[PDB]
Design a protein around this motif. Structure first.
Motif, PDB file in Angstrom:
ATOM      1  N   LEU A   1      30.963  36.900  25.380  1.00  0.00           N
ATOM      2  CA  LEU A   1      29.698  36.533  24.766  1.00  0.00           C
ATOM      3  C   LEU A   1      28.907  35.589  25.652  1.00  0.00           C
ATOM      4  O   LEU A   1      27.826  35.932  26.135  1.00  0.00           O
ATOM      5  N   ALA A   2      29.437  34.402  25.885  1.00  0.00           N
ATOM      6  CA  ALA A   2      28.742  33.386  26.651  1.00  0.00           C
ATOM      7  C   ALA A   2      29.203  33.444  28.096  1.00  0.00           C
ATOM      8  O   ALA A   2      29.890  34.375  28.509  1.00  0.00           O
ATOM      9  N   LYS A   3      28.859  32.432  28.876  1.00  0.00           N
ATOM     10  CA  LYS A   3      29.162  32.464  30.293  1.00  0.00           C
ATOM     11  C   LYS A   3      30.666  32.411  30.522  1.00  0.00           C
ATOM     12  O   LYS A   3      31.458  32.194  29.605  1.00  0.00           O
ATOM     13  N   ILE A   4      31.056  32.638  31.768  1.00  0.00           N
ATOM     14  CA  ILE A   4      32.453  32.727  32.168  1.00  0.00           C
ATOM     15  C   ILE A   4      32.722  31.677  33.232  1.00  0.00           C
ATOM     16  O   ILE A   4      32.041  31.649  34.259  1.00  0.00           O
ATOM     17  N   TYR A   5      33.715  30.827  33.000  1.00  0.00           N
ATOM     18  CA  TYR A   5      34.249  29.979  34.056  1.00  0.00           C
ATOM     19  C   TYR A   5      35.510  30.487  34.707  1.00  0.00           C
ATOM     20  O   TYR A   5      35.724  30.223  35.888  1.00  0.00           O
ATOM     21  N   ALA A   6      36.376  31.158  33.987  1.00  0.00           N
ATOM     22  CA  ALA A   6      37.738  31.251  34.451  1.00  0.00           C
ATOM     23  C   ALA A   6      38.213  32.684  34.451  1.00  0.00           C
ATOM     24  O   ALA A   6      37.865  33.476  33.576  1.00  0.00           O
ATOM     25  N   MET A   7      39.043  32.990  35.433  1.00  0.00           N
ATOM     26  CA  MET A   7      39.453  34.361  35.684  1.00  0.00           C
ATOM     27  C   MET A   7      40.627  34.321  36.632  1.00  0.00           C
ATOM     28  O   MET A   7      40.461  33.968  37.800  1.00  0.00           O
ATOM     29  N   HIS A   8      41.798  34.699  36.149  1.00  0.00           N
ATOM     30  CA  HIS A   8      42.978  34.762  36.986  1.00  0.00           C
ATOM     31  C   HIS A   8      43.579  36.143  36.822  1.00  0.00           C
ATOM     32  O   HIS A   8      43.753  36.606  35.695  1.00  0.00           O
TER      33      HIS A   8
ATOM     34  N   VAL B   1      40.818  37.404  44.116  1.00  0.00           N
ATOM     35  CA  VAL B   1      41.306  38.668  44.634  1.00  0.00           C
ATOM     36  C   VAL B   1      42.593  38.976  43.894  1.00  0.00           C
ATOM     37  O   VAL B   1      43.116  38.123  43.173  1.00  0.00           O
ATOM     38  N   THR B   2      43.107  40.187  44.056  1.00  0.00           N
ATOM     39  CA  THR B   2      44.412  40.521  43.518  1.00  0.00           C
ATOM     40  C   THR B   2      45.499  40.176  44.516  1.00  0.00           C
ATOM     41  O   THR B   2      45.251  40.002  45.708  1.00  0.00           O
ATOM     42  N   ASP B   3      46.724  40.064  44.009  1.00  0.00           N
ATOM     43  CA  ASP B   3      47.858  39.933  44.909  1.00  0.00           C
ATOM     44  C   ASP B   3      48.014  41.177  45.762  1.00  0.00           C
ATOM     45  O   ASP B   3      48.508  41.098  46.890  1.00  0.00           O
ATOM     46  N   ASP B   4      47.608  42.329  45.235  1.00  0.00           N
ATOM     47  CA  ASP B   4      47.608  43.544  46.036  1.00  0.00           C
ATOM     48  C   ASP B   4      46.451  43.567  47.016  1.00  0.00           C
ATOM     49  O   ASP B   4      46.538  44.216  48.060  1.00  0.00           O
ATOM     50  N   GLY B   5      45.364  42.878  46.697  1.00  0.00           N
ATOM     51  CA  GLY B   5      44.219  42.880  47.577  1.00  0.00           C
ATOM     52  C   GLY B   5      43.293  44.050  47.400  1.00  0.00           C
ATOM     53  O   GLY B   5      42.419  44.262  48.241  1.00  0.00           O
ATOM     54  N   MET B   6      43.450  44.824  46.331  1.00  0.00           N
ATOM     55  CA  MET B   6      42.618  45.995  46.111  1.00  0.00           C
ATOM     56  C   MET B   6      41.579  45.786  45.023  1.00  0.00           C
ATOM     57  O   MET B   6      41.126  46.759  44.417  1.00  0.00           O
ATOM     58  N   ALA B   7      41.176  44.546  44.779  1.00  0.00           N
ATOM     59  CA  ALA B   7      40.097  44.265  43.847  1.00  0.00           C
ATOM     60  C   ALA B   7      39.716  42.806  43.975  1.00  0.00           C
ATOM     61  O   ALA B   7      40.531  41.978  44.379  1.00  0.00           O
ATOM     62  N   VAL B   8      38.470  42.498  43.639  1.00  0.00           N
ATOM     63  CA  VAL B   8      38.043  41.125  43.422  1.00  0.00           C
ATOM     64  C   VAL B   8      37.230  41.088  42.144  1.00  0.00           C
ATOM     65  O   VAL B   8      36.247  41.815  41.997  1.00  0.00           O
ATOM     66  N   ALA B   9      37.649  40.275  41.203  1.00  0.00           N
ATOM     67  CA  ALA B   9      36.856  40.080  40.011  1.00  0.00           C
ATOM     68  C   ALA B   9      35.903  38.940  40.294  1.00  0.00           C
ATOM     69  O   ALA B   9      36.226  38.036  41.062  1.00  0.00           O
ATOM     70  N   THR B  10      34.708  39.010  39.724  1.00  0.00           N
ATOM     71  CA  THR B  10      33.730  37.935  39.828  1.00  0.00           C
ATOM     72  C   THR B  10      33.168  37.717  38.438  1.00  0.00           C
ATOM     73  O   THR B  10      32.169  38.335  38.072  1.00  0.00           O
ATOM     74  N   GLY B  11      33.787  36.864  37.668  1.00  0.00           N
ATOM     75  CA  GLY B  11      33.127  36.388  36.483  1.00  0.00           C
ATOM     76  C   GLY B  11      31.920  35.573  36.854  1.00  0.00           C
ATOM     77  O   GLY B  11      31.784  35.121  37.985  1.00  0.00           O
ATOM     78  N   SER B  12      31.015  35.393  35.905  1.00  0.00           N
ATOM     79  CA  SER B  12      29.762  34.746  36.251  1.00  0.00           C
ATOM     80  C   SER B  12      29.009  34.390  34.986  1.00  0.00           C
ATOM     81  O   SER B  12      29.166  35.024  33.948  1.00  0.00           O
ATOM     82  N   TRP B  13      28.146  33.397  35.104  1.00  0.00           N
ATOM     83  CA  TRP B  13      27.456  32.858  33.948  1.00  0.00           C
ATOM     84  C   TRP B  13      26.557  33.869  33.255  1.00  0.00           C
ATOM     85  O   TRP B  13      25.941  33.523  32.244  1.00  0.00           O
ATOM     86  N   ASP B  14      26.452  35.097  33.754  1.00  0.00           N
ATOM     87  CA  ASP B  14      25.794  36.160  33.009  1.00  0.00           C
ATOM     88  C   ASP B  14      26.729  36.808  32.013  1.00  0.00           C
ATOM     89  O   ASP B  14      26.319  37.733  31.310  1.00  0.00           O
ATOM     90  N   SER B  15      27.975  36.344  31.955  1.00  0.00           N
ATOM     91  CA  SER B  15      28.995  36.757  30.998  1.00  0.00           C
ATOM     92  C   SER B  15      29.602  38.105  31.330  1.00  0.00           C
ATOM     93  O   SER B  15      30.251  38.716  30.485  1.00  0.00           O
TER      94      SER B  15
END
Ligand SMILES: CCCCCCCCCCCCCCCCCCCC(=O)N[C@@H](CO)[C@H](O)CCCCCCCCCCCCCCC
Lengths: 236, 338, 233, 128, 55, 259
Positions: free
Chosen positions: B53-60, B318-332
């Motif tokens: 819903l709202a912005k995102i700070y955290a992503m593991h 990044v992933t431990d595999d290295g085949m993705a990067v997630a980018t959470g962001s204040w646009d939710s």
């Protein structure tokens, strides 16, 4: 199709979670979030107490829930955090209408500078401060029935010559009204200096026993919502 | 009177600077002056884990390079499938002011923390169905900036008290406290072998920490403003500082000094999050003017831009595999790139 | 996690029976929820299913449109009816959950399922090996089973589950999706597969490792089973 | 490291003229909208001047209006505050401060008990 | 204020007595490492088919 | 009756150019995620696509008019262009009215979240509008086919009734903006006034003049002055597919920020 029986039941579970999330969004969109700042001299506790009566040892942030006209407000009084604030302040860029509180009768230039900083902060733009000038009555006795003059700490108070006040509360002696308006005007100038249109600064003369503070935020606060709507409906 | 202490301290500093100076026999540009540039990096959001819903700070990421936990300022940890868009779990947080999130390397736990000064340990793979809290770690006197799991048993929190801490979940109490910093610590990064770690603070100076006794092993001091993000280089012998003065910098522990600064004139927004991929030839830096950048960490020239976010980027992993990067962001919106 | 049902008993070939369930030990309104039956001296069968938040309700090919698996979350029960039961589906019932997210393990816990008695198809089948194989403790049993259909979806994972049965208490999951152990199971159980012909490898056969090693696949919805190899002491 | 030495401070009489130099190093001088703040005995930190990035804007606290002039010559990486018409009420230690965030027009808690971009300090005294 | 400026000071002599290798002995480390894992890292060498984030 | 109008070619091409530019740009900027695609995005998108489908047909009538009897080239495709000239021209009116009601809701009743419920609610309203309108005007597909009754249905329900919606709607928005003044309120008030005037001057004269031709002209006799008024007013009415892209999402910072 290209997905198994568990994949089907898993997308079922995910859609179920979407349904719960949209119920939560229905809850969360219709609520208004106020970050309540102010200094230790400010009546910051008293505003919260008043609107609480209107409605955990080292807790970083407190909060009071309250409602005015079937509208649920959710006010966060920042708790046992440190003296610096430049990093946890960014966590309230999405709140509606920061409440700012100062002590009129006061050492006031610190409050002036802090509100000046709150105005100009990135992520704090697009958020319209609400001013609550506490110790209004204490300012009455500090001016009309006292010694210390605002002339020092504020040299351009002798040469002020109050503008045409609309209708100050008639109990106010003119000196009190002049000084009281001086404070409001110092805050407003730096409000209008940099925040072109999307900030607003809503001044108010609030006290320890002023029971209208809940409503006073609804109004103002409702009017902030209206400005946001005018812009994001392409109507502005 | 007492000034002898202050004078000799400033002298210890004046000698530390020259000891560091006597080591850089070449610059990290020079040793990579002859190396092949990386090219241009183009990445597209394969998935878009929308639903916050709202912005995102955290992503593991979970340590399977597939599971993803994200913390949002409305107070949700949503655990995503990230191959599908399926939402594995959704945890209703208590303090909706979460700034960090974790995922135990086993995967059985998530810890969220936040601005309530409390590091909460939610438990996924219970013999029961739903997630519920295991312990609540309340000893910090200021908001939590970051939290990392040593294992299923030890978690390391970075707080706004200028302190980093180590915890034992079942005992629910600190084992060790790391107390060198002067400004509040904003991001934490366990070492690849979890023997030690590094904390980037609001003093413009990150510090390596040896989590066995609690002594600050060393102290780099190169940034102009406060540091927003840290991340170990995968070999463990370096790490990346993205500061609020719009610069990324690379330090390495054994040479004990700044090596290379990733800069460019147009950036006037600071960093929020950094991460190397797997090989450390690519340093993803998350920025504040609504879009990430991708940095060739060795040769330091920008190579690749991510720009798909309306609002600023707050988390990046990044992933431990290295085949993705997630980018959470204040646009939710989370965004998985490839 | 205690799964206790009601009903069951002498049933006429035309008497309406309400085989309700009751389950008051777990996050009921989160779980997929099958039913399975064992023909008394035979293998065990797939029956009605209901997913979490009833949206997908597959069925067998003997109940399909017959007696209506239902749900009631606020009471945490799987309500049922049934009336005719043509004197040959008569068996002892069970209650099973199965949570379906990435990495979840389905069919982790089964119930007891009262045992009502009667007063008188391009599906898959689990082809099994010799059913007795009587073995004493210490040996490495490798009892096997084969599938009609190739059990390897484009996901990348082979869909086979693995159970026991005991002279008494309910069956129970050993490994799920053919490679991964359950919760309350010793590590000595294991699983090695190829996609179409595959088995489980046991090491230590203690007094509570005696039973019948059934089998089941979750790639389509016949939810097939095998005859069941019965290991002896 | 962010470092701010400064000079100045003396026994100047109550009405004297004392100029407070401030030497910055380690950070690019011109992007940081620095301040002047001070700690007098028996009280907490307060604020004085707000010299901007380029020298364009200047602010003051009331009690020191019309008395102090602020220059920041980026050539020397130096900040300045010279003092005129002293009274024996502004006799505090002077702390040459700085913004957290560059390219910005606001300072947060420059008067922090524990800010980390200050000078060591300069003390000024009067009346003798 | 001794009870703390004292703390900061022996922390510095902790920093002082660390035999530091010349940066060239980090050149080998970092650069050779990145070479080592260069082929495998799938954000540098496209994986267009082998990866599970296609389509 | 007279039909000899030499202004339709040039005017129709100019309207075509401006409308295609504006609405194509609007569609190309309404299809991006951009920070929580709102409930009121589908209404603007529907207005855009209705206007675009409307103006896709206009060059065909231009080609008709250049060569007089020309769309005999259509070879029985003339009862589909005739529909598309009207099935979506009225559809744009209803999407415009819905957008007005959403604005009204917003301002005047901001603490009653009724301009929400996205991507179901919104569309399903879009879907209802399209098929609803669809059926109604399909009684056209099976010179002219004499049915005055059709005109009356498209007069009261076509424009008169929706006109009385946004007129009261925007009027109640305006009364709020009257009692921070300067920037926000002056600009929004001017925008509302311009939107209301451009809506009034485009359609309302067109329908009343249509409806009078009908009866008076081709059932009895008429006067060419009335013919001139009808044709010029119809030309303005077609022009609304250029103003609507301009009015509703030019001055809006909410939109003008997307670009
Ligand atoms: C090339 C052009 C001519 C040359 C240029 C232009 C004209 C130049 C010549 C002169 C004038 C033209 C000839 C006379 C005028 C036309 C002949 C009359 C024919 C006529 O009257 N009209 C059509 C237009 O579609 C029809 O009546 C309307 C049909 C209904 C569709 C919408 C109704 C909404 C229904 C549903 C509502 C809400 C839904 C549920 C919510 C409650």
């Amino acid at each position: 199709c290209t997905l198994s029986a568990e994949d089907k039941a898993a997308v079922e579970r995910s859609k179920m979670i979407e349904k719960q999330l949209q119920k939560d969004k229905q809850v969360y969109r219709r609520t208004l979030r106020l970050l309540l700042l102010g200094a230790d001299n400010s009546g910051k506790s008293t505003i919260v107490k008043q609107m609480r009566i209107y409605h955990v040892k080292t807790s970083g942030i407190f909060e009071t829930k309250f409602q005015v006209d079937k509208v649920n407000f959710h006010m966060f009084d920042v708790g046992a955090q440190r003296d610096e604030r430049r990093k946890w302040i960014q966590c309230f860029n999405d709140v509606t209408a920061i409440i700012f509180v100062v002590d009129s009768s006061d050492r006031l230039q610190e409050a002036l500078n802090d509100f000046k900083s709150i105005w100009n902060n990135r992520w704090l733009r697009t958020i319209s401060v609400i001013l609550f000038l506490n110790k209004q009555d204490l300012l009455a006795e500090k001016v009309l029935a006292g010694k210390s003059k605002i002339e020092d700490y504020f040299p351009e108070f002798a040469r002020y010559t109050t503008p045409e006040d609309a209708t100050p509360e008639p109990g106010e002696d003119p000196r009190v009204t002049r000084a009281k308006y001086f404070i409001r005007k110092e805050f407003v100038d730096i409000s209008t200096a940099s925040g072109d249109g999307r900030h607003i600064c809503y001044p108010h003369f609030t006290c320890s026993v002023d029971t209208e503070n809940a409503r006073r935020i609804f109004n103002d606060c409702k009017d902030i919502i209206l400005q946001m709507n005018l812009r994001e409906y392409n109507l502005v | 009177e007492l000034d002898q202490l202050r004078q000799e301290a400033e002298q210890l500093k004046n000698q530390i600077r020259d000891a560091r100076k006597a080591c850089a026999d070449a610059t990290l540009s020079q040793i990579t002056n002859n190396i092949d540039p990386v090219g241009r990096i183009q990445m597209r959001t394969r998935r878009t884990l929308r639903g916050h819903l709202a912005k995102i700070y955290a992503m593991h990421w979970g340590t399977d390079s597939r599971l993803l936990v994200s913390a949002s300022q409305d107070g949700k940890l949503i655990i995503w499938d990230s191959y599908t868009t399926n939402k594995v779990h959704a945890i209703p947080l208590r303090s909706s002011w979460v700034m960090t999130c974790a995922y135990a390397p086993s995967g059985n736990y998530v810890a969220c923390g936040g601005l309530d000064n409390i590091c909460s340990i939610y438990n996924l793979k219970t013999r029961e169905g739903n997630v519920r809290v295991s312990r609540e770690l309340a000893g910090h006197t200021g908001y939590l900036s970051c939290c990392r799991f040593l294992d299923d048993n030890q978690i390391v929190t970075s707080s706004g008290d200028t302190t980093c801490a180590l915890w034992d979940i079942e005992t629910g109490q600190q084992t060790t406290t790391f107390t060198g910093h002067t400004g509040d610590v904003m991001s934490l990064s366990l070492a690849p072998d979890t023997r030690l770690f590094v904390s980037g603070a609001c003093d413009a100076s990150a510090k390596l920490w040896d989590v066995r006794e609690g002594m600050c092993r060393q102290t780099f001091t190169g940034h102009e403003s406060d540091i927003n993000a840290i991340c170990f280089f995968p070999n463990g012998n370096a790490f990346a500082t993205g500061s609020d003065d719009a610069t990324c910098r690379l330090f390495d522990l054994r040479a004990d000094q700044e090596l290379m600064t990733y800069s460019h004139d147009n950036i006037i927004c600071g960093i929020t999050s950094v991460s190397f991929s797997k090989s450390g030839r690519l340093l993803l830096a998350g920025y504040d003017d609504f879009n990430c950048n991708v940095w060739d960490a060795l040769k330091a020239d920008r190579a690749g831009v991510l720009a798909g976010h309306d609002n600023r980027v707050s988390c990046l992993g990044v992933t431990d595999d290295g085949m993705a990067v997630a980018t959470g962001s204040w646009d939710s919106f989370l965004k998985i790139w490839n | 996690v205690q799964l206790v049902e009601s009903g069951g008993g002498l049933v006429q070939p035309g008497g309406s029976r309400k085989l309700s369930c009751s389950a008051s030990g777990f996050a009921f309104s989160s779980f997929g929820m099958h039913w399975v039956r064992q023909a008394p001296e035979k293998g065990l069968e797939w029956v009605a299913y209901i997913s979490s938040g009833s949206g997908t309700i597959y069925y067998a090919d003997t109940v399909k449109g017959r007696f209506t698996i239902s749900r009631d979350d606020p009471k945490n029960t799987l309500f049922l009816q049934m009336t005719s039961l043509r004197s040959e589906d008569t068996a002892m019932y069970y209650c099973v959950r199965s949570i379906y997210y990435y990495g979840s393990s389905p069919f982790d816990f089964w119930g007891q399922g009262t045992t009502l008695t009667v007063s008188s198809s391009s599906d898959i089948v689990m082809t099994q090996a010799t059913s007795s194989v009587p073995v004493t403790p210490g040996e490495s049993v490798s009892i096997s089973c084969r599938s009609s259909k190739s059990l390897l979806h484009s996901n990348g994972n082979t869909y086979l589950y693995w159970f026991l049965q005991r002279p008494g208490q309910s069956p129970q999951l050993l490994i799920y999706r053919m490679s991964n152990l359950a919760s309350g199971v010793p590590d000595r159980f294991s699983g090695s597969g190829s996609g179409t012909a595959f088995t489980l490898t046991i090491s230590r056969l203690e007094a509570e490792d005696v039973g019948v090693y059934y089998c089941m696949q979750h790639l389509e919805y016949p939810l097939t089973f095998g005859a069941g190899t019965k290991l002896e002491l | 490291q962010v470092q701010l030495q400064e000079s100045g401070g003396g026994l100047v009489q109550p009405g004297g003229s004392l100029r407070l130099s401030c030497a910055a190093s380690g950070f690019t001088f011109s992007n940081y909208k620095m301040n002047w703040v001070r700690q007098a005995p028996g009280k907490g930190l307060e604020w004085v001047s707000d010299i901007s990035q380029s020298g364009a804007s200047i602010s003051y606290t009331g009690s020191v209006k019309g008395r102090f002039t602020i220059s920041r010559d980026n050539a020397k990486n130096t900040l300045y505050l010279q003092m005129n018409s002293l009274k024996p009420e502004d006799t505090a230690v002077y702390y040459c401060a700085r913004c957290p965030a560059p390219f910005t027009r606001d300072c947060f808690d420059v008067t922090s008990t524990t800010y980390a971009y200050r000078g060591q300090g300069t003390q000024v005294t009067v009346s003798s | 204020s001794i009870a703390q400026a004292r703390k900061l000071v022996e922390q510095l002599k902790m920093e002082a007595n660390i035999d530091r290798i010349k940066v060239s002995k980090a050149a080998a480390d970092l650069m050779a490492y990145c070479e080592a894992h260069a082929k495998e890292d799938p954000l540098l060498t496209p994986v267009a088919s082998e990866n599970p984030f296609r389509e | 009756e007279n039909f000899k109008r030499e202004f339709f070619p040039i005017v129709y091409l100019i309207i075509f150019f401006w409308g295609v530019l504006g609405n194509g740009l609007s569609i190309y900027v309404f299809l991006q995620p951009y920070k929580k695609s709102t409930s009121v995005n589908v209404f603007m998108l529907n207005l855009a696509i209705s206007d675009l489908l409307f103006i896709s047909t206009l060059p065909f009538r231009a080609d008709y008019y250049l060569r007089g009897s020309n769309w005999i080239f259509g070879d029985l495709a003339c009862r589909i262009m005739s529909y598309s000239l009207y099935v979506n021209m009225y559809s744009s009116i209803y999407f415009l009215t819905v957008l007005s009601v959403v604005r009204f809701l917003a301002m005047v009743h901001p603490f009653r979240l009724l301009h929400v419920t996205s991507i179901r609610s919104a569309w399903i309203l879009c879907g209802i509008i399209w098929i609803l309108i669809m059926a109604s005007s399909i009684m056209l597909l099976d010179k002219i086919a004499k049915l005055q009754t059709m005109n009356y249905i498209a007069l009261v329900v076509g424009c008169l009734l929706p006109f009385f919606t946004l007129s009261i709607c925007y009027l109640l928005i305006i009364r709020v903006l009257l009692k921070g003044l300067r920037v926000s309120h002056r600009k929004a008030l001017t925008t509302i006034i311009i939107t209301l005037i451009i809506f009034f001057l485009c359609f309302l004269p067109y329908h009343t003049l249509r409806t009078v031709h009908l009866t008076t002209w081709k059932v009895g006799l008429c006067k060419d002055r009335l013919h001139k008024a009808l044709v010029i007013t119809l030309a303005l009415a077609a022009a609304n597919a250029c103003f609507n892209p301009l009015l509703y999402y030019f001055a809006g910072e909410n939109f003008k920020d997307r670009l």
